[PDB]
Amino acid sequence: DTVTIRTRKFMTNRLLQRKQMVIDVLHPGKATVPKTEIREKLAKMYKTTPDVIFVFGFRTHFGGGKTTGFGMIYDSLDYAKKNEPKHRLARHGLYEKKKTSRKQRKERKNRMKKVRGTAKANVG
């Protein structure tokens, strides 16, 4: 409709098996576009399945006519799971991390170094 998408600095990174580009999103009177709709429009643009497009770093200009971000389109989902940061895969729901703070891990590590042997595994 009235929200449009262009890709500026295209580059075919064969070393990490992807295509990387700068994304300019035009939405004259709407909010900042959610990354899901940008992903579907990029999938329609480049004739790919939409779960291999990873977009990030969108900053909307003052006044609100344009937003600029970065994106990459991988060859498959396997190269995506190999070459992407964990947090972006968790943004897409493909990765999950343990729910533990640094304090618990650090105090646990300092606790089990007062103990020598298999009893190290008995510290909870």
Binding site: N13, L16, N83
Partner: protein, 262 residues
Amino acid sequence: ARGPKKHLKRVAAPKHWMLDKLTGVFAPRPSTGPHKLRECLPLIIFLRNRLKYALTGDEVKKICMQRFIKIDGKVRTDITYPAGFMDVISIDKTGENFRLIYDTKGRFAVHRITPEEAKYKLCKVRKIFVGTKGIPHLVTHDARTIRYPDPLIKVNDTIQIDLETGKITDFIKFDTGNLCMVTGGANLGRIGVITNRERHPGSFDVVHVKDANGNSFATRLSNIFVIGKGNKPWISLPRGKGIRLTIAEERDKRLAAKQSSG
């Protein structure tokens, strides 16, 4: 200090890396290698900052650990391996070859070379010594030592070596009237012809170099790399041909390029 240092502050880094101020506190700190810390480009900076093949250091680590980058014909998996002057970088997946030679402003330039030009390199010879059983040995500017060099080769000459075997294919002597590139000091990046050498015993010799446009500049003897036999180089030169334009002429070139296209 109590031992060797392992960190490099970002503002203490060499200026020809062109690292900015606000990205981090630290600079990549080139590991020990054939090239000096102040006179090298690490693989992380070349792959990330220059070629833009990567955005972060972990991405450069992924590229390196897939065994894609080759330096001087050998695979390097160190992100901070010091690549220096005349070094050939081969990326076989993208089919690219580069030779790290200086831009006229004094910085390493992204210079693409033909694949058959990537089979050799030039090395300025640092010292010659007769080792045991009377065997002559040759040490070049990138820590390459060669047994049995040609007897006519002396110090401050240049050898062209094949990268597959590491043997001397040819050599160029340090004579008046030969082509050279300046590899240090203020005139760094300039390509000219040798006109003089002012011998000061107990001190540094002086090579006066004349440019293709008629401009003369002196350097120390250690700052000269002979790259050509008389007038033609044995390598491929960058977009600039070694001529340093004054800031007025560079301004005029900028205005003319803006006027013709735009």
